[PDB]
Design a protein around this ligand. Sequence first.
Ligand SMILES: Clc1cccc(-c2cc(NCc3ccncc3)n3nccc3n2)c1Cl
Length: 290
Amino acid sequence: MENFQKVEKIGEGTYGVVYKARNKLTGEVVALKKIVPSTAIREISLLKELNHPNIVKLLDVIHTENKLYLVFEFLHQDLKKFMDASALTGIPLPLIKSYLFQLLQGLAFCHSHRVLHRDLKPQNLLINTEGAIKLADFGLARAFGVPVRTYTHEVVTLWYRAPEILLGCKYYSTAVDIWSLGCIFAEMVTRRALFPGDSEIDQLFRIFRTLGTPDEVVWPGVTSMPDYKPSFPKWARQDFSKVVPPLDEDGRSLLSQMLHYDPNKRISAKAALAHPFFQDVTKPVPHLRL
Ligand SMILES: Clc1cccc(-c2cc(NCc3ccncc3)n3nccc3n2)c1Cl
């Protein structure tokens, strides 16, 4: 750590404080994250080779005095702040499309190596002045787990959590990240969180209120999941035209596939990249204020 000069505290992450820092050597500007069981060390070590343009680069791992620090490529802003800043007029559709397209490329790459994110949310989708967007903290969930509260006691959001996780599935798949991304896609379009749950049951019931209470027809096996209760109220499914106006038919079709209840039926990142919604995709340069 003596090799870094902390510039400023940028946030309180799930696992510890996050700082903008400078390498006292290469003068490099990086993000430094404070987080050790050998298993965690090995899992994180593997992430050093999981490199792709849409995945924030893991530069190094420092394990000293029995403390763990992760050094990442630095990006100036996150999607949460960009969305709040674009609340008045909303993010232009071409830019939402470009961001979704890029995030799907990031997921397709990691998923092809069987690595999941598991806790995708706007706060960990980072953007630069070139029109790129990247996934931060990929793979950390398997290495360290996803706690109920962060190190500073802040509630870890449930808003983007897949229903199979909420229903107690033990071995969820790469489909969980597609669900989260679909929730983020809808939020960029409407300028409001899709399912802003404030407890596990509120999260589930908000999902059911929009997509209908899942049953054996739409999700074979659902009634046998650990946290499924036959006493759940039965809500009817809303039309997507009501859920995400003014998204076009291509967008609504893709969203609806990203939010399928059955994880085995939910669209993959690779399939989503081939969807007609991306026919006219471009790479606009957003207006950033650093
Ligand atoms: Cl708290 C938290 C949670 C998840 C990811 C992050 C977080 C945020 C950024 N940059 C965005 C940013 C820059 C300056 N001030 C605020 C944000 N980065 N940049 C590389 C890793 C990283 N992780 C952070 Cl800070």
